[PDB]
């Protein structure tokens, strides 16, 4: 069959079947580059099948059509050609696709979680024929307030890789590690973009009304002092270069993420003003052994996560009085995802029992994946040996000479001196360190870990977990 791809070829026409709702103009953007690159040279099926092979998940990224409807009926063209280079130079191709349901409505209740827990979901897709979507979620229950959501998403100028999203949000988030809950209400504007190299860009504008209510009776004075309302209008950029072979259980390749957020400064307005950035670099490296050629299954990985939260003045001046950060914005570290072997939010400053955040943090990981004996390396479940370190510090004005005690704000030189001292604190003393052994499951909806952790170095007030610990999620250190 491979000899059919080595022959010269020249495609004549292509047809798409079943795309009644989607406008043909949107369909053009994927097929014109296919249409332009035609009859370029011999052995073009080596080029042709891959370029249409690009198209199939190109249309799948539109999410309009069902994943099963991709019946390919490529064959030799019936009409003859005048002195063709090869009997199968001319081909006829027709593609069969079935669009997904235009409207999806869902609702239900679940008495197992709450006495009156009920949810309502509605999805409208491919409105106006151009892959615009609209999802509305509503949730109620008992001992809780109503939660709404309404996201409108659309590709820009017919490009499936450039997607603009508008979201209206109202939700309440429980934060047991700080003995309070946060009520969110606002709107987000996102412009997600996928580069040709696979890198993902995302520029989002957010304007959310945060409100700290429902303090537990054990709430610390720090949590009480930060309770109340706060409006954060921020502009955030998210970058992601993921080259991991299996992103859900990495055996090779590397991941790089950057999340830079600017709030309140300049044209943005609100009750907070800072510049927050995070960098997350990860990687893995397979290792082979003489006892078995090919894929051995053992690999050594790593990780490194950094973050700095810099207070900024309001207005358009870089030099000016800056308010100290609030518990809403400060970083949180520790837990089965961030730093394995500790309580959720178990690192950093603690006021009594509440885990108050920090402004500068740095976490790292070293782990090795191994397969169990009498089980092939292709199995999605493996043994893991890991060692995690982390530091979370808070900005202080101890280095300042004098400031008006009425004012809470810090001058520009004071903040810079405070950040320099905070970063210096990371590099002294052994970081809060934990190690353990566990089993990892790579079932592609979520990673499951069964870890036996054992804290080694710890700051007083931090909470380690010496027993078995289970962590489920898509992000791990």
């Amino acid at each position: 069959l491979d000899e059919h791809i080595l022959t010269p070829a020249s495609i004549s026409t292509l047809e798409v079947h079943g795309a009644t709702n989607t406008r043909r103009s949107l369909l053009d953007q994927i097929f014109k580059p296919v249409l332009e690159d035609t009859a370029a040279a011999g052995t073009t099926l080596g080029q042709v099948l891959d370029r249409v092979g690009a198209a199939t998940k190109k249309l799948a990224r539109f999410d309009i059509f069902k994943e099963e409807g991709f019946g390919v009926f490529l064959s030799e063209a019936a009409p003859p050609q005048s002195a063709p280079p090869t009997d199968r130079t001319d081909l006829d191709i027709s593609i069969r696709v079935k669009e997904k349901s235009r409207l999806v409505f869902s609702a239900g209740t679940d008495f197992g979680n709450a006495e009156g827990s009920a949810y309502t979901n509605a999805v409208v897709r491919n409105i106006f024929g151009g892959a615009e979507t609209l999802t509305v979620n509503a949730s109620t229950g008992t001992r809780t307030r109503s939660a709404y959501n309404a996201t409108f998403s659309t590709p820009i100028n017919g490009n499936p890789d450039l997607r603009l999203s508008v979201e209206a949000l109202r939700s309440a988030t429980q934060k047991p590690w700080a003995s309070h809950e946060e009520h969110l209400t606002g709107a987000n504007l996102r412009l997600a973009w996928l580069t040709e190299k696979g890198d993902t860009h995302a520029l989002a504008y957010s304007s959310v009304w945060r409100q700290l209510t429902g303090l537990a009776p054990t709430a610390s004075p720090t949590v009480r002092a930060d309770a109340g309302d706060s409006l954060k209008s921020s502009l955030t950029h998210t970058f992601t270069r993921d080259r991991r072979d299996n992103p859900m259980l990495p055996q090779s390749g590397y991941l790089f993420r950057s999340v830079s957020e600017l709030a309140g400064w300049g044209p943005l307005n609100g009750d907070v003003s800072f510049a927050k950035t995070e960098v997350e670099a990860s990687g893995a490296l397979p290792v082979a052994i003489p006892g078995l050629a090919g894929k051995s299954g053992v690999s050594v990985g790593g990780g490194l996560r950094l973050g700095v939260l810099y207070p900024l003045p309001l207005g358009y001046s870089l030099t000016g009085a800056a308010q100290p950060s609030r518990i809403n914005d400060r970083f949180q570290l520790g837990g089965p995802n961030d730093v394995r072997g500790f309580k959720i939010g178990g690192l950093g400053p603690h006021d009594g029992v509440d885990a108050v955040g920090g402004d500068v943090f740095a976490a790292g990981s070293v782990n090795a994946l191994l397969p169990l004996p009498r089980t092939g390396p292709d199995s999605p479940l493996r043994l893991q040996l890991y060692a995690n370190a982390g530091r979370l510090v808070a900005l202080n004005s101890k280095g300042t000479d004098k400031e008006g005690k009425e004012g809470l704000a810090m001058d520009s030189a004071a903040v810079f001196k405070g950040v320099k001292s905070a970063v210096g604190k990371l590099t002294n003393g052994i970081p809060s360190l934990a190690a353990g052994v566990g089993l990892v499951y790579a079932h592609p909806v979520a990673r499951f870990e069964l870890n036996f952790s054992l804290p080694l170095v710890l700051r007083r007030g931090e909470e380690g977990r010496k027993g078995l610990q289970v962590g489920v999620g898509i992000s791990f250190l």
């Binding site: 349901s101 235009r102 409207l103 999806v104 409505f105 869902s106 609702a107 239900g108 209740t109 679940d110």
Partner: peptide
């Protein structure tokens, strides 16, 4: 229960 009326 969890109803689903998709069309």
């Amino acid at each position: 229960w969890n109803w689903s009326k998709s069309f």
